[PDB]
Amino acid sequence: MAKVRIYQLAKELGMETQELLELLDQMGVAYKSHASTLEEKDAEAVRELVKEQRGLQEKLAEEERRKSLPRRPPVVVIMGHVDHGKTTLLDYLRKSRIAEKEGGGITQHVGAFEVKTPQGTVVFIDTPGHEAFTTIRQRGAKVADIAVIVIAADDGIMPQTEEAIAHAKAAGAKLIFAINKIDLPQADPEKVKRQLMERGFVPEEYGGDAIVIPISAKTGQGVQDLLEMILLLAELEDYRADPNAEPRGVILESKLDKQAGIIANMLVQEGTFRVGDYVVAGEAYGRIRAMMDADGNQRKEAGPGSAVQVLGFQELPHAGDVVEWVPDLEAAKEIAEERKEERKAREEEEKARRPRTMAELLR
The missing domain is CATH 3.40.50.300 (P-loop containing nucleotide triphosphate hydrolases)
Structure with missing residues (x-):
């Protein structure tokens, strides 16, 4: 700490001599050679700057990882x-x-x-x-x-x-x-x-x-x-695909198991679904109570490319519907309901205009 020669400080910090001398030049700290002694204030400033720089190198490298x-x-x-x-x-x-x-x-x-x-x-x-x-x-x-x-x-x-x-x-x-x-x-x-x-x-x-x-x-x-x-x-x-994106999948098919109730098979495309998540698929929603993969294993998580049987839907989802993660039960109901009452409104579209003429009939 005080007082340290530059070669001692280089050893302490795991830096090459010329590397530390280059840093001292950047900081405007003068020295005759790597045998010179640093004032305590300069050495502390060095240790801090190196710490910071190494942390930003790491942060910069970790963000370059997270986009592949x-x-x-x-x-x-x-x-x-x-x-x-x-x-x-x-x-x-x-x-x-x-x-x-x-x-x-x-x-x-x-x-x-x-x-x-x-x-x-x-x-x-x-x-x-x-x-x-x-x-x-x-x-x-x-x-x-x-x-x-x-x-x-x-x-x-x-x-x-x-x-x-x-x-x-x-x-x-x-x-x-x-x-x-x-x-x-x-x-x-x-x-x-x-x-x-x-x-x-x-x-x-x-x-x-x-x-x-x-x-x-x-x-x-x-x-x-x-x-x-x-x-x-x-x-x-x-x-x-990003396993940390908002989960998205697609319903492959759905059916009724007499014992377990509504089951749906889904293929995950983005993100990672987890047991306990709320999901919406079309007008169907539920809490994921269980997921089982093709080897019969209970899965707590299902990421991109996984096909799983999901328990928890409260109505049969349709094949081809996108399964979307939502944050809670309230959101699941709102989204499902807004889609239902919108379909019901465009159904009254064809219960009006244009069903055209009526009945040229028997007898």
């Missing part, structure tokens, strides 16, 4: 004609998880499952519908990043295929075309490619931008390439 959001896994939906193999592929992927069971392990159906891979994890949506609207249409907060369109090599592109493609494009998904059943004798992948090109999807093979991957969902051939391609796209699109 962590990666989140790609979310994938598998689509196409019901007989072309999307179901066989989804089943293959779901099985590929367990790898000679556990056992048990257990498993729970929460609307999506994860496929873990040396290159990363992929989330596959696994729900019986598409979302809502017509059959099988979607609105539809965006759920999936990538849509794998599974087309049978024998049958080729059909109307369910075209519907799947239009839905995926409408939802903003990146498309991967998976040409399935390639082992069949009547397999005609080249015809499917021509059909893709007729529709404006030119395969990369021919210098276009459409991603086309041959697979066999029955045997698993090509499925690994499909996963690697999903994960490559994820790295290039660079999907990220």
